[PDB]
Design a protein around this ligand. Structure first.
Ligand SMILES: Nc1ncnc2c1ncn2[C@@H]1O[C@H](COP(=O)(O)OP(=O)(O)OP(=O)(O)O)[C@@H](O)[C@H]1O
Ligand SMILES: [Mg+2]
Ligand SMILES: [Zn+2]
Lengths: 58, 615, 43
DNA sequence: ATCTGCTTTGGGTGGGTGGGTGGGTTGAGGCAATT
DNA sequence: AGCAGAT
């Protein structure tokens, strides 16, 4: 088992957490977090953000 | 290493310290409450008041159970008692009252794992300073408390850097002076935490010197038993650092003897005392006077001479409206109402500078005083520069005056380089540096207050003003108000001035009694309030000022037809007039700029020069 | 490692018994075969 | 694994056949160019 | 005193 030195947080859990974040995430979550939900559109906010960012980077 | 028998036993002193901490009261015990706050992560600095120790000692004596003199022992040798007190606190730290996230802390997890490893090994630690989260300081023995209990307080008695001699080393003393240099805060290492790439253990090393030699080979029991050679490596995440800062304290002018030069002394600040000293402050630093031994070869070469410094432990820092303000600006001179009014207008410097079209009209009123030697130019400059919060006094510094009035004395003498610098400042309000070593550009929206003498040393009526002034005509034009003060002999005025100066010399106070000058603090706060405000102007006032401008331009052209005129009016004069009106309105505290303010500004510009030239 | 040599990532691997060994390197931070290879090579 | 031996800081108790692109930085005095 | 080398 891999653990960061001096802490009690697993590296595997971190990797899976960030992978889940990247494969599935939308700007609408950010908008609701900042209390800007009423500005949510129907196309850009509902489309995966970082997946598009990875595709364009490739 | 022979031995002596000193009349001090540290066991009774340690017992006394513990009793003082657990029992003293001045609610519950004061120091126990402070320790409770320290445990809950609220507090990170414990200050021991020697006054409290004296009070506790005298209370014990009154009860009849006389004990050892703790305060004198602390004062005579203070380095040891820091560690003694820290140990006493470590022994009696109360349990926390508020739950905290232990797992978040790196050290808690590391020490838990160390405990687990030790338990496993047994089934088949770390220095005390590592876990400390507080700093201990000594507050000196106050003079009043020492006098109350019939004792002498060496610690709180102030000393100059000269009086701090070589026999004071190792004591708790106080120094008086002004700080001349403070270094940046930086991390000083107390305990170093290593790691073993093979054994999986951690080592700790204590550092109490300017230098140290890092460990390179594992010393863990497992490594030695197995003989495995595991290299030790540093880890900054687990080490313990204390904020460090080095300052310098210099003698005051009044403390240096006759025909001598001032001396300076180093100061070390650690823990939560950092950032409590800045250059220019006059302070009473209390600290422990210690040497700074050299190391290695330098120690061998240096001989027996030793550097010294002070471990800071406690720092004590030392401390009709128009007419009234004008007369109160400088009561020790003979009244110059117009000049004082203009200087107050300069001080407030009201302006609405929001053109936003690419650049804006200058937002500072500049004043120039030019007069034959004998009139109070330097005194006016000194007073107007002390009153202002940003005033900077120089002789023919600008950075310090940014967004403030600049006090330039002997303006005429100044060198061409500084003349070009000010010319740049007025036009662009910017400080530009173009050097290979550094390239930094700073804005400078600062006002200038200049004092100069005519070309020949005195004003010559035969020659016109322009010829009398050495400075370029453009520079004079750029000034918002140019004041020409002359010294005309006269029986009555001379008698009044002589009586004033002579009364001041005999009694050391203002002679005038018809009116009472306003307190400087009230004037300063009112000036700041006025600076905070923002007036406005209408269209009718705009038309009035426009009409005044055409009248002034016609009159100035007619005057320029002759050689007597200082200089024909220009749009700069219009901008100056409106600037003065805005400042006057700011003084009035009213948005709407009254015609009265414009009229007063016009009168001020007229009397700036014509009033005395026509004489 | 993508980052430079002085980035400074530290590891704690858990043995089948409750003891923790220390390894250095991002590759170790990600992988276990690399961690064991480094453990062997550092001897 | 133990015994033998050189060299610092920075500074004139190493020097100018090591120099100043290896650091020790103000003060005075002479010279060309600028005036 | 720390480190560089020969027995
Ligand atoms: N109206 C006055 N009342 C009292 N003292 C005055 C007055 N005018 C001038 N003095 C005195 O004149 C002395 C010289 O003045 P100050 O040094 O301020 O200016 P100055 O001599 O014109 O300047 P400079 O140094 O440029 O020649 C000061 O001691 C000041 O006290
Ligand atoms: Mg003067
Ligand atoms: Zn080890």
């Amino acid at each position: 088992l891999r653990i960061i030195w001096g802490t009690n947080v697993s590296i595997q859990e971190c990797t899976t957490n960030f992978r889940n974040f990247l494969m599935s995430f939308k700007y609408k979550f950010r908008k609701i977090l900042d209390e800007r939900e009423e500005f949510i559109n129907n196309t850009t906010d509902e489309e995966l953000y970082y997946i598009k960012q990875l595709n364009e980077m490739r | 290493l022979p031995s002596i028998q000193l009349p001090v036993d540290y066991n009774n002193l340690f017992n006394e310290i513990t009793d003082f901490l657990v029992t003293f009261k001045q609610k519950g015990p004061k120091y126990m409450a402070m320790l409770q706050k320290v445990a809950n992560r609220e507090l990170n600095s414990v200050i021991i008041d020697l006054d409290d120790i004296l009070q506790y000692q005298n209370e014990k004596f009154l009860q009849g159970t006389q004990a050892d003199d703790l305060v004198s022992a602390i004062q005579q040798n203070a380095n040891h008692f820091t560690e003694l007190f820290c140990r006493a606190i470590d022994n009696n730290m109360p349990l926390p009252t508020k739950e905290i996230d232990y797992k978040d802390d790196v050290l808690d997890v590391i020490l838990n794992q160390r405990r687990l490893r030790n338990e496993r090994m047994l089934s088949d630690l770390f220095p005390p300073n590592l876990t400390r989260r507080y700093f201990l300081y000594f507050k000196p023995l106050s003079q009043n408390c020492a006098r109350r209990y019939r004792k002498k307080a060496i610690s709180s008695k102030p000393l100059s850097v000269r009086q701090i001699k070589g026999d004071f080393l190792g004591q708790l003393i106080t120094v008086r002076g002004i700080i001349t240099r403070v270094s940046d805060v930086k991390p000083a290492v107390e305990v170093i935490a290593y790691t073993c790439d093979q054994c999986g253990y951690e080592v700790f090393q204590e550092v109490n010197s300017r230098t140290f030699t890092p460990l390179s080979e594992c010393t863990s029991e497992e490594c030695s038993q197995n003989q495995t050679k595991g290299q030790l490596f540093m880890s900054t995440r687990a080490s313990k650092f204390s904020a460090f800062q080095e300052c310098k304290i210099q003698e005051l002018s009044q403390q240096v003897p006759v025909g001598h030069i001032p001396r300076s002394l180093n100061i070390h600040v650690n823990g939560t005392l950092v950032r409590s000293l800045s250059p220019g402050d006059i302070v009473d630093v209390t600290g422990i006077f210690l040497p700074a031994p050299y190391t290695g070869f330098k120690a061998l070469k240096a001989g027996l001479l030793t550097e010294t410094y002070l471990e800071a432990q406690f720092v004590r820092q030392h401390k009709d409206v128009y007419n009234r303000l004008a007369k109160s600006i400088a009561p020790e001179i003979y009244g110059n109402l117009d000049v004082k009014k203009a200087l107050l207008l300069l001080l407030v410097g009201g302006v609405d500078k929001r053109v936003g079209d690419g650049m804006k009209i200058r937002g500072d009123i500049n004043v120039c005083l030019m007069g034959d030697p004998g009139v109070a130019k330097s005194q006016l400059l000194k007073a107007i520069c002390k009153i202002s919060p940003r005033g900077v006094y120089t002789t023919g510094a600008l950075v310090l005056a940014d967004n403030g009035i600049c006090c330039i004395d002997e303006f005429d003498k100044m060198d061409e380089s500084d003349r070009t610098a000010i010319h740049e400042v007025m036009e662009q309000q910017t400080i530009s540096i173009s050097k290979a070593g550094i390239n930094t550009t700073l804005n400078a929206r600062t006002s200038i207050l200049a004092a100069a003498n005519p070309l020949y040393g005195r004003y010559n009526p035969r020659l016109s003003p322009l010829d009398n002034i050495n400075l370029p005509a453009a520079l004079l034009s750029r000034f918002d108000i140019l004041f020409l003060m002359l010294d005309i002999p006269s029986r009555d005025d001379d008698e009044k001035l002589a009586e004033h100066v002579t009364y001041v010399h005999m009694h050391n106070k203002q002679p005038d009694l018809d009116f009472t000058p306003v307190e400087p603090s009230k004037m300063r706060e009112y000036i700041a309030y006025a600076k905070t405000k923002r007036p406005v102007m209408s269209e009718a006032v705009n038309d009035y000022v426009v009409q005044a401008y055409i009248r002034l331009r016609q009159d100035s052209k007619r005057e320029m037809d002759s050689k007597f005129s200082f200089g024909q009016a220009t749009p700069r004069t219009l901008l100056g007039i409106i600037r003065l009106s805005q400042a006057l309105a700011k003084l009035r505290l009213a948005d709407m700029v009254d015609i009265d303010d414009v009229e007063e500004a016009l009168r001020l510009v007229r009397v700036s020069k014509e009033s005395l030239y026509q004489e | 490692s993508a980052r430079h040599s002085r980035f400074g990532g530290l590891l704690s691997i858990q043995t089948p018994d409750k003891t923790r060994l220390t390894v250095s390197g991002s590759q170790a931070l990600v992988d276990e075969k690399i961690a064991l290879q480094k453990l062997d090579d550092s001897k």
